[PDB]
From a paper:
Kinesin1 functions as a hetero-tetramer composed of a dimer of kinesin heavy chains (KHC) bound to two kinesin light chains (KLC). KLC is also composed of three regions: a N-terminal Heptad Repeat (HR) region that binds to the KHC stalk, a TPR (Tetratrico Peptide Repeat) domain involved in cargo recruitment, and a variable C-terminal region. The TPR domain of KLC1/2 belongs to the 42PR motif family and consists of six TPR motifs (TPR1-6) with a non-TPR region of 40 residues inserted between TPR5 and TPR6 motifs. The N-terminal capping A1 helix exhibits structural plasticity adopting two distinct and defined orientations relative to the rest of the TPR domain.
In order to analyse the structural impact of LFP-motif binding on the TPR domain of KLC, especially at the TPR1 motif, we crystallized an unbound complete TPR domain of KLC2 and compared it to the previously solved KLC2-TPR bound to LFP-motif. The structure of KLC2-TPR[A1-B6] adopts the common KLC-TPR structural fold composed of 12 α-helices (namely A1 to B6 helices). The non-TPR region of 40 residues connecting the TPR5 motif to the TPR6 motif is made up of an α-helix (αn1; residue 410–420), followed by a disordered region (421–444) that is not modeled in the crystal structure due to the absence of electron density. Interestingly, the three KLC2-TPR[A1-B6] molecules make the same crystal packing contact with a 2-fold axis symmetrical counterpart leading to TPR1:TPR1’ interactions. The two anti-parallel A1/B1 helices from each molecule are roughly perpendicular to each other and bury a total surface area of 1533 Å2 involving numerous hydrophobic residues. SEC-MALLS experiment reveals that KLC2-TPR[A1-B6] is a monomer in solution with a weight-averaged mass of 36.5 ± 1.0 kDa. Thus, this TPR1:TPR1’ contact alone is not sufficient to stabilize such a dimer in solution. In the KLC2-TPR[A1-B6] structure (this study) which is the unique unbound form, the A1 helix exhibits a “IN” orientation, while in the three ligand-bound forms, the A1 helix exhibits one or the other orientation. Finally, because of the crystal packing contacts at the TPR1 motif, we cannot elucidate what component of the crystal packing contacts or the binding of the LFP-motif triggers the A1 helix reorientation observed in KLC2-TPR[A1-B6] (this study) structure.
Residue numbers in the entry: 194 to 420, 445 to 479
Amino acid sequence: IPARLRTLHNLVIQYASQGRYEVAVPLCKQALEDLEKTSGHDHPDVATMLNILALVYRDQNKYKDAAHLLNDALAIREKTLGKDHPAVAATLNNLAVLYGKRGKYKEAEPLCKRALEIREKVLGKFHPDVAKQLSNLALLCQNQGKAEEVEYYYRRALEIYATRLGPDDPNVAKTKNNLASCYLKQGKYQDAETLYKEILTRAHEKEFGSVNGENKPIWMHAEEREESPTVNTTLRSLGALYRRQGKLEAAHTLEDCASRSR
């Protein structure tokens, strides 16, 4: 936000979060035609202005129009700033968020790969912000039913989350679970069970010290009995996974464990 547009911003910000669409839009519209004569159209502050009103149309559910503004901001940003510049990836992302809210997922997908390619160059292939861009771009492929890609990007995100960050890490457990869902969505049940196990082995290794032969994880006590907020879901998922297999003496165990742990 520039110093110049910074005092008008706070007011529109205020006159939007008060449901005064009749006040806010003209304040933007007229402040844009003002700056349009000042520093030309292809100036970055028009692009910044076209992004603040675009966020006004998004704020009061007029997505058709919101994106019409963010493509214009993107055209300016592409011009002066650059084809592979960070602020152009930023507006290639905000524009993709709008396509998803309108249901145009097939149409947000090419924007999100470009927002990623800019991130891959800027931050480096293995940066954790690349892992969140991947965890996003996979959700988009899921909303398209492109399972094979959903699997790919989550695994790519997991590679960064697991390697760059720690083991107990929330994203490590969350991305495992998301990939574990994807595997089931495609009938890769051993792959899914494997993941649901890993999360728990670590979860038990976190609060019970370490994995022994006499102090094993829940799933191991459950598979033998048959003869983290993200963990309540793992327990519920894996539990019901044993249900498919017929392992009911093992399904009830985690289902009992899940209802207790809250």
